[PDB]
């Protein structure tokens, strides 16, 4: 029963829209258990300077209870049905979802609706979470990788909204008002911008009837039905070096502006990132690993790890790589890294893309390893790509990619481009933007 | 900072600045910095009345 076929067999993802704008979608499996959630098209990018951190503060309350069912009432009801509720909030995408028995499919939707709509926002709890978020910041600040990507955005998108952290400023957390969290919810958590997605043993029809029932938003004026278009974020070849010779290792991330969800090149970009891949000191492969960079990394003890990435966004994106190294091998590593990038633009081989494509498909499949991940793909696809994109399609697109294509596309986005750099730790060895800028050409 | 490109570039610039006067002098006023007394072949028997060092 060849791969090809198993692909065209996976049940189609159904989507139906309500009069309020809400879009309900789902992929039905025989699974006795399931996952359902609302993927809102909101994040820190929608926040401005005065409320940076709202969507995150709000994330901390969508679970402390609603108007109808207060704290214990909510938790008790949810804990007692063996369900798992949890979510997240990115720069331009927020999500809240539950993992429950396909049986409870309809009661969950009710619960979801009650959260996005009737958050209690108990002004008593607010002051508590305020101290919690402040505490999580102290912690997240010790996560070099995070510090490094935030900074990456901080300078690559300096001057724009995309250059803000999701968690927000220490001041905003200390001062946001119930009212602020209030309007945040009112302004963003809106039907035409939300997506009720589900995966598992669930009837799409049953799913949508339940949606109609509690997700009964009303829309009178045109304004309400409209989805705002965010102001464009300006990428800037720049660098931010936060140095502290006291930290054990050093983090380095370099990137170029990426196209954005909609753009087909992304496929090619992924196939490329698939060649250089990623590495880490516990990869059994060793000196024989296929990725030259990885291989080089191993042969020269160049880094405790490295990883490529193609972080997409609506209108923009970040295509780069990140590596952790010892103070004294930062240069050799950076050198080799740009080396492979230049190689991508100038000499990618068919054999490489062949391996890359296979590896990619495999990752593509792992993206749908369970109701939750599958669900996450739906919520995001609709939200980002507008519709759903089947593995059969992705797989198609991927197959079209070839060396020539990789080189052209990579040259297009990499060659002779002013990159964005972020470095943290004992970064004295790696140095000079110029020296790095010249690494952008010839290979 | 790495010598290159910071000082390799600075130095090249510097060279070109020194080069102008040096060539201007060389091409336009060749013997400006030189004594005209030295256009007279050495005469072991006569020290020029006006003899100054370079
Ligand atoms: C070209 C002359 C510089 C003009 C200027 O005064 O810049 C001021 C200004 C820059 O101001 P600034 O940022 O404060 O100055 C930075 C440095 O002075 C910017 O200067 P710099 O560091 O890039 O270059 C300094 C340069 C300039 O040297 C000079 O000052 C002349 O001197 C050298 O590079 C050294 C070579 C010296 C050659 C002399 C050879 C000896 C033969 C003697 C006979 O440029 C302009 O206003 C535009 C000028 C067009």
A59 belongs to the catalytic site: yes
Cis peptide before B5 (omega within 30 of 0): yes
Tokens describing residue A86: 């949890």
B10 touches chain A (CB under 8 A): no
Q: What dotted CATH number matches A238-441?
A: 3.30.830.10
Give the residue on A whose Cα is nearest the Cα of B1: A432
C-alpha of residue B14 to centroid of ligand 1, in Å: 9
Q: What are A266's two structure tokens?
A: 């992304």
Chain B residue at shortest CA distance from A432: B1
Resolution of the model in angstroms: 3.0
Residue that is written with structure tokens 């990159």 in the block: A419
Q: Are A92 and A41 in contact (CB under 8 A)?
A: yes
| Total Cβ atoms within 10 A of residue B9 | 12
Cα(A278)–Cα(A274) distance, integer angstroms: 8
What is the Cα–Cα distance from A141 to B25, expressed in whole angstroms?
64
A435 touches chain B (CB under 8 A): yes
User: Which residue does chain B place closest to A437, by CA atoms?
Assistant: B5
**Local structure of residue A169 (DSSP, 8 states):** -
The minimum-distance atom of ligand 1 relative to the CA of B18 is 40
Which has the closest alpha carbon to A227: A441, A409, A410, A46? A46
* Residue A339 structure tokens: 């080396």
Asked if A437 has any chain B CB less than 8 Å from its own CB, the reply is no
DSSP E strands: which ranges in A220-264? 238-243, 250-257
B6/A431 CB distance under 8 A: no
B4 to chain A: which residues are within 8 Å by CB? 435
The DSSP symbol for A33 reads E
Q: What is the DSSP letter of A60?
A: T
Angle, CA B17 vertex, CA B11 and CA B33 arms, to 5°: 125
Angle at B37 between CA B36 and CA B38, to 5 degrees: 90
Work out the angle between the directed axes of helices A350-366 and A391-400 (0-180°, nearest 10): 170
Task: Give the integer Cα–Cα distance in Å for A268 and A397.
Answer: 9
Please report the DSSP string for A350-405 in residue order: HHHHHHHHHHHHHHHHHTTSSHHHHHHHHHHHHHHHSS---HHHHHHHHHH--HHH
Q: Which of A27, A28, A47, A59 is the catalytic position? A: A59
Backbone angles phi, psi at A50, to 5 degrees: -75, -30
Distance of alpha carbon A356 from alpha carbon A379, whole angstroms: 27
Cα atoms found within 13 Å of the Cα of residue A393, Cβ hemisphere only: 9
Task: Classify residue A365 by burial, with Cβ atoms within 10 Å: 0-12, 13-18, 19+.
Answer: middle
Burial readout A185-214 (b: 16 or more C-beta within 10 A, e: otherwise): beebbbbbbbbbbbbbbbbbeebbebbbeb
Neighbours of B49 (CB within 10 A): 6
A432: left (phi over 0), alpha (psi -120 to 50) or beta: left
Q: What is the C-alpha separation between A340 and A337, in angstroms, rounded?
A: 5
In DSSP notation, A69-132 reads: S-HHHHHHHHHTTT-EEEEEE-SS-EEEEEEEEGGGHHHHHHHHHHHHH-B---HHHHHHHHHH
Ordered by start, the domain boundaries in chain A are 13-226, 238-441
- For tokens 């990788």, the residue is A145
A393 φ, ψ to 5°? -75, -60
Whether the CB of B36 sits within 6 Å of ligand 1:
no
At residue B36, φ and ψ (nearest 5 deg) are -80, -10
Q: Give the number of other Cβ atoms within 10 Å of residue A393's Cβ.
A: 12
Identify all chain A residues contacting B2, using CB atoms and an 8 Å cutoff: 431-432, 435
- Tokens read off for A182: 């209030």
Element (H, E) at A308: strand A305-312
Q: Give the integer Cα–Cα distance in Å for B4 and A135.
A: 45
Residue A208: C-alpha distances to residues A188, A213, A256, A361, A373 (Å): 22, 9, 41, 31, 20
Q: Distance (Å, rounded) from C-alpha A293 to C-alpha A280?
A: 11
Q: Is B5 on the interface with A (CB under 8 A)?
A: yes
Say if residues A237 and A421 touch (Cβ distance below 8 Å).
no
* CA-closest candidate to residue A47, choices A112, A87, A88, A94: A94
Q: How far apart are the C-alpha atoms of A33 and A268, rounded to whole Å?
A: 35
Candidates B7, B15, B17, B23: which one to mutate for ligand 1, based on the most atoms within 8 Å of Cβ? B17
Residue among B2, B4, B5 whose CB faces A431 most closely? B2
Is A431 in contact with B1 (Cβ distance < 8 A)?
A: yes
Residues of A in contact with B1 (CB under 8 A): 431-432
Rounded CA gap, A403 and A424, in Å?
34
Q: How far apart are CA A83 and CA A98, in angstroms?
A: 7
Which residue, chain included where needed, has tokens 């939300």?
Answer: A194
Q: What is the CATH number of domain A13-226?
A: 3.30.830.10
Q: How was this entry determined?
A: X-ray
Closest CA to A323 of A236, A217, A429: A429
* Chain B touched by A441 (CB under 8 Å): no
Q: What's the distance, CA A300 to chain centroid?
A: 32
Which sign, positive or negative, has the C-alpha torsion A397, A399, A404, A409? positive
Query: How many other CB atoms are there within 10 angstroms of residue A136's CB atom?
Result: 14
For residues A240 and A256, give the distance between their C-alpha atoms in angstroms, rounded to a whole number.
15
Whole-angstrom distance, CA of residue B42 vs CA of residue B37: 10
CA distance A433 to B11: 20
Write the CB contacts of A270 (distance below 8 Å, at least 6 apart in sequence): A310, A360
Long-range contacts of A5-13 (CB under 8 A, 24+ apart): A7/A390, A7/A391, A7/A392, A7/A395, A8/A392, A10/A390, A10/A391, A10/A392, A12/A390, A13/A378, A13/A388, A13/A390
Report whether A152 contacts A253 (CB < 8 A).
yes
Pocket lining: B32 vs ligand 1, CB cutoff 6 Å: no
Round to whole Å and give the CA distance between A36 and A32: 13
Please give the angle made by the CA atoms of A358, A362 and A367, to the nearest 5 degrees: 145
Give the SS3 label for residue A269.
helix
Q: Is A366 exposed, middle or buried (0-12, 13-18, 19+ CB in 10 A)?
A: exposed
Neighbours of A54 (CB within 10 A): 28
The angle formed by the CA atoms of residues A183, A189 and A194, to the nearest 5 degrees, is: 170
For residue A21, report the phi and psi dihedrals to the nearest 5 degrees: 120, -25
Burial label for A292, CB within 10 Å (0-12, 13-18, 19+), is: middle
Chain A partners within 8 Å of B10 (Cβ): none
SS3 state of residue A19: coil
Mutate to test the pocket of ligand 1, among B14, B23, B32 (most ligand atoms within 8 A of CB): B14
- Alpha carbon distance A340, A333 (integer Å): 11
At residue A367, φ and ψ (nearest 5 deg) are -75, -10
Name the residue at shortest CA distance from atom 20 of ligand 1: B10
A13-226 and A238-441, same CATH topology: yes
Classify A213 as helix, strand or coil: helix
What's the CA-to-centroid distance between A236 and ligand 1, angstroms?
29
CB of A176 closer than 8 Å to CB of A54: yes
Query: Would you state the structure tokens that stand for residue A311, as one six-digit string?
Result: 């972080």
Atom 32 in ligand 1: residue holding the nearest Cα: B14
Phi, psi of A23 (to 5 degrees): -115, 120
């Amino acid at each position: 029963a060849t791969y090809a076929q198993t692909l065209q067999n996976i049940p189609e993802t159904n989507v139906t829209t309500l009069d309020n704008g809400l879009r309900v979608a789902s992929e039905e499996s025989s699974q006795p258990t399931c996952t359902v959630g609302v993927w809102i098209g909101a994040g820190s990018r929608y926040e401005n300077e005065k409320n940076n951190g709202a969507g995150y503060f709000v994330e901390h309350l969508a679970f402390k209870g609603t108007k109808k069912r207060p704290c214990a009432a909510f938790e008790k009801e949810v804990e007692s049905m063996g369900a798992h509720f949890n979510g997240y909030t990115s720069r331009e995408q927020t999500a809240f979802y539950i993992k429950a028995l396909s049986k409870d499919m309809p009661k969950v939707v009710e619960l979801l609706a009650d959260v996005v709509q009737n958050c209690a926002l108990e002004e008593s709890q607010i002051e508590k979470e305020r101290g919690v978020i402040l505490q999580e910041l102290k912690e997240m600040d010790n996560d070099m990788t995070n510090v490094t990507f935030d900074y990456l955005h901080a300078t690559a998108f300096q001057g724009t909204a995309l250059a803000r952290t999701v968690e927000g400023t220490t001041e905003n957390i200390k001062h946001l008002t119930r009212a602020d969290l209030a309007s945040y919810i009112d302004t963003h958590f809106k039907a035409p911008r939300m997506v009720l997605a589900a995966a598992g043993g669930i009837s799409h029809k049953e799913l949508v009837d339940a949606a109609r029932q509690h997700f009964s938003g009303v829309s009178f004026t045109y304004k309400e039905d409209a989805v705002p278009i965010l102001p464009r974020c300006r990428f800037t070849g720049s660098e931010i070096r936060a140095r502290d010779d006291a930290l054990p290792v050093a983090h380095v991330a370099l990137a170029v502006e990426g196209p954005g969800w909609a753009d087909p090149d992304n496929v090619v970009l992924h196939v490329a990132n698939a060649i250089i891949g990623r590495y880490d000191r516990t990869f059994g492969g060793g000196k024989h690993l296929s990725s030259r960079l990885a291989a080089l990394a191993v042969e020269h003890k160049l880094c405790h790890s490295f990883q490529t990435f193609n972080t997409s966004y609506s209108d923009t994106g970040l295509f780069g790589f990140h590596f952790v190294a010892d103070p004294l091998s930062i240069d050799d590593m950076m050198f080799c890294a740009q080396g492979e990038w230049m190689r991508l633009c100038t000499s990618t081989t068919e054999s490489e893309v062949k391996r890359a494509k296979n590896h990619l498909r495999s990752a593509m499949v792992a993206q749908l390893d369970g109701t939750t991940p599958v669900c996450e793909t739906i919520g995001s696809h609709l939200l980002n790509y507008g519709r759903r994109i089947s593995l059969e399609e992705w797989d198609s697109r991927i197959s079209a990619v070839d060396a020539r294509m990789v080189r052209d596309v990579c040259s297009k986005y990499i060659y002779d481009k002013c990159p964005a750099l972020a470095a943290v730790g004992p970064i004295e060895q790696l140095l000079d933007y110029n020296r790095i800028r010249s690494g952008m050409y010839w290979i | 900072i790495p010598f290159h490109p910071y000082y390799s570039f600075k130095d090249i610039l510097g060279l070109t600045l020194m080069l102008t006067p040096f060539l201007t002098l060389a091409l336009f006023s060749p013997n400006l910095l030189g004594d005209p007394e030295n256009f007279t072949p050495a005469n072991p028997l006569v020290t020029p009345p006006h003899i100054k060092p370079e």
